[model samples]
Target: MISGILASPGIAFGKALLLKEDEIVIDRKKISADQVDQEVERFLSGRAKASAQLETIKTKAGETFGEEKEAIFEGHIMLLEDEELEQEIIALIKDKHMTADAAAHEVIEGQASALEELDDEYLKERAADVRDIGKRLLRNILGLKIIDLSAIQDEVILVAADLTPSETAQLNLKKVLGFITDAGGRTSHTSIMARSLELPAIVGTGSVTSQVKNDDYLILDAVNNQVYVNPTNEVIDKMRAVQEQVASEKAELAKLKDR
Candidate 1:
């Protein structure tokens, strides 16, 4: 059995399979090559049109939030217009004869691998942005839409490498019991969102994708940092006990809110 990270940039979701102790697999086939191309084109086109709009927003942000905030907005602009990323993807498409989506996926996975290979924490954080952009481009290309989780009746556990703020915003808080991801920092956007939602979540599981199948039975214990893959009856009982304990604690916390 394989285990790896599952990440979503709120743009796309994929499992990173660990083939060996040192080798990691990112399944780019999740998004078709054609879809990949479309996403890249859409993003590039939208960004081109958004230049003036971004300037307007930057001006407004500067006025409303101050110069410091405006500089942050400028940083975002630079991120979106990263020439190196663009060149990398274009070369992949042209030389590899791959679709835009595929090129973006390759670029993202390559950047991520590079970051992991690096020794600096600050440089590693940049991987989040790279993954984020790739996901957004892929989503746009495939026209992937997120559905309201509350609308579904079945109990479900969400698995991903990461979740974005907007994607988390749309999730049905009631139906989701827990979440697991292949990657993320303790203070990452998704982790904070999970905390805010009062959901049990485990981040930085390091490639959970290869271990899980679609609709596979999973038990996640955030408190213990344990995940049961195809759990047996004994594991289920343990999880049930943990759940009850969590519920009791939640009730106690709820009372505190009233006081």
Candidate 2:
């Protein structure tokens, strides 16, 4: 059994779905003065595309979640449309001669780092949002596509290094039974999303991805922060019983909440 930090409380039994996302590489090659106009235009188009994508996501979130949850994407759209941030990227491209993707990475990372260094916990958590927007913009600039989580066709437990808010929002809860990640803590967006979706989750496992393979049967006891991979049939039965009890307890709690 592998122990991890409990991000949400529940039990889950399913095959593992390893979420290996495509890596986004930034080319930091400097641009010449003549290329400034083209680079700036490219950045603008990318920013526009990112904004449009966020708006679509925001609408989807509003439909699936609610106004409060969709507000996260609304904030992301605002950040993407922020005049100051656009000016900063343009300045980097024009003055420092940085590539569009590189300039965006530098500016966005700086802002995120500043937020992460702040004393207030809520402000610090905003860093993840900044980073998520940065990635979306960069990917748009590079014309790369993110793997669609909503495309998952079977019930499984997701295993990933980390899950960004946009990616977490794309998850189909019925298909994704639960999740465990090598990175993130309770304050991370992944954890927050898991709790909001009422999905069992274990985070900060450090290295579970390397040990477990795709389609490996997993018994996840998020309440205990324990994960068992392909355990004995007896163990599986025991965990199955626990899962039933957990489901009933959730149903009981829902009844209480309705009253």
Among all candidates shown, the one with the greatest TM-score: 2
Model 2: lDDT of residue 57:
85
Candidate 1, residues 1-259: lDDT per residue as tens digits? 3332222221111222221222222335445455556645665775665555455656655664357546645765676688877787776765666766666676677776787777765556556545655565555555565344447576567776666533454455566656676656654655765554555565776767665666767655454445667667875776687657766897789779867
User: Which pairs clash in model 2?
Assistant: none
Candidate 2, superposed: residue stretches over 4 Å from native? 5-11, 182-184, 204-206, 221-225, 232-259
Model 1, position 25: C-alpha lDDT score: 29
lDDT of 2 by residue, 1-259 (tens): 5777787787767888886666788886777899888888878777667678788888877877788778777877887788888888888887888988888899887889999889877677678778888887787777786777788777778888887667777677777777788876656667777677766777788888888878888887776777787799988888788768876898789679767
The parts of candidate 1 lying over 4 Å away from their true place are 1-127, 134-153, 164-175, 184-188, 195-198, 233-242, 245-259
Error of 2 at 57 (Å): 1.7
Instruction: Report the C-alpha displacement of residue 251, candidate 2, in angstroms.
Output: 14
Error of 2 at 191 (Å): 3.4
